């Protein structure tokens, strides 16, 4: 139509439509008026130049008005004048910086000074929670943000299709020297190489893999060889058990385990010319192994065994207890007079569990 201040005939799209009063005003009488009231008047004078029909003398409409006017102000006037608007807003209205929100959906930034925990972006008109910034659904009403996100994650189809492979990766691998973490299952090669420190360690027990002639453990018999030392409940040893025997240790302690899905999709890192690339495990997924391969299904069972601090020595036979005694106590056991195999077994078990604790660096949950 025409500008409401000076009457200059313009198309509607070449003026500023004041949100409050819907008066059309050219860029020059917009920029001039609001720049002046900033540099020569007080913030309550920043009404519409045509009508003054923002009733800015009651704190009811005061904050909503400026939150919207800030949008048209930012676009039409120049920096130090727009910064003067924020100063006088802080010093005259808010007594603090205005709360500026960034819309996660459309990248727009806007001042939000209202009570509600959900905010509508003035650009995309989509509403989000002001704390977690996720899209607002009524499921979030009356619920904490963690409740809400823990809800969306446990309802996304692509997350549940991944099955137990997600559980194995959220079981991270933390390098015990540089404390770098990896969202990797421990896979089938316990010898891990961390990248920032080059430190070599077992991903199941976090014990060091010693180079040649570097192992300080007493009575070690492979000191001239690359190796590490593992507790009896580390995946390095427990991966040699059948899934049946690992399930037997769990069942004897009433620990549940999956056998069906809730090739193998466990994510691994392959070295390509430009970095690392996620190659899904892809190995066979046998029946009763809950969608994983045997290797990753055993890692999943050892995960539950370690999380509950279950002791595999409770299932050791005499031969296993004797091997464990030579390995961790550094003495060859010997039966005593009057002992039968059960009493000999019970004695070796007591001494072992009393003297050699389970893995002291194994992650347990």
């Amino acid at each position, epitope marked *: 139509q025409e500008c409401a201040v000076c009457g200059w005939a313009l198309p509607h799209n070449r003026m500023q439509a004041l949100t409050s009063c819907e008066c059309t005003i050219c860029p020059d009488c917009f920029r001039q008026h609001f720049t002046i009231a900033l540099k020569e008047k007080h913030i309550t004078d920043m009404v519409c130049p045509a009508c003054g029909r923002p009733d800015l003398t009651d704190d009811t409409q005061l904050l909503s008005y400026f939150s919207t006017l800030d949008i048209q102000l*930012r676009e039409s006037l120049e*920096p*130090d004048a*727009y*910064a*003067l608007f*924020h*100063k006088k807003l*802080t010093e005259g209205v808010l007594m*603090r*910086d205005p*709360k*500026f929100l*960034w819309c996660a959906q*459309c*990248s*727009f*930034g806007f001042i939000y000074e209202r009570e509600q925990l959900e905010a509508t972006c003035p*650009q995309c008109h989509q509403t989000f929670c002001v704390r977690c910034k996720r899209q607002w659904e009524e499921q979030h009403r009356g619920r904490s943000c963690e409740d809400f996100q823990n809800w969306k994650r446990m309802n996304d189809p692509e997350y549940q299709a991944q099955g137990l492979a997600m559980y194995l990766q959220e079981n991270g691998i933390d390098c015990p*020297k*540089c*404390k*770098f973490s990896y969202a990797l299952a421990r896979g089938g090669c316990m010898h891990f190489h961390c990248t*920032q*420190c080059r430190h070599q360690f077992c991903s199941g027990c976090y014990n060091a893999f010693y180079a040649k002639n570097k192992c300080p453990e007493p009575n070690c018999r492979v000191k001239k060889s690359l190796h590490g030392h593992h507790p009896r409940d580390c995946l390095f040893y427990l991966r040699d058990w059948t899934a049946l025997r690992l399930q037997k240790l769990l069942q004897d302690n009433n620990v549940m385990f999956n056998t069906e899905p809730p090739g193998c999709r466990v994510i691994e890192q392959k070295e390509v010319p430009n970095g690392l690339r996620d190659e899904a495990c892809g190995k066979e997924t046998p029946a009763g192994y809950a969608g994983l391969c045997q290797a990753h299904y055993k890692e999943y069972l050892v995960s539950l065994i370690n999380a509950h601090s279950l002791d595999p020595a409770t299932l050791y036979e005499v031969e296993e207890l004797e091997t464990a005694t030579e390995r961790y106590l550094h003495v060859r056991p010997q039966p005593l007079a009057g002992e039968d195999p059960p009493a000999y077994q019970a004695r070796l078990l007591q001494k072992l569990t009393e003297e050699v604790p389970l893995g002291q660096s194994i992650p347990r949950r």
Partner: nanobody
Amino acid sequence: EVQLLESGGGLVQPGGSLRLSCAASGFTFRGYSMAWVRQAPGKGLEWVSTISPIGTYTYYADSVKGRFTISRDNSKNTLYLQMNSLRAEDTAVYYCAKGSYSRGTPFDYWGQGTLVTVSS
């Protein structure tokens, strides 16, 4: 126009502390948010922390919450970053950045950067 100069970078032992500073000029310091971003080896830029014009609000990336403290001295036009319990993963070039209110740009300029490496 805008100039931003970082200082305080160096070599730090694991678990150590370091305080970066950023001297700014060429714009109305008190009228803008200020931010820190960082470039880890082989990456681009990762947001670290933002502080409101007078410091009413401070924001931190999750990886640094509780360990880092952002602050500013508007009288000196200087921005600070107090870094505690440093880890190897905190190794990066740290950049001072001038905040902006325009859509899609929380900052429109960042400085030359100061390198911080955490040994071991």
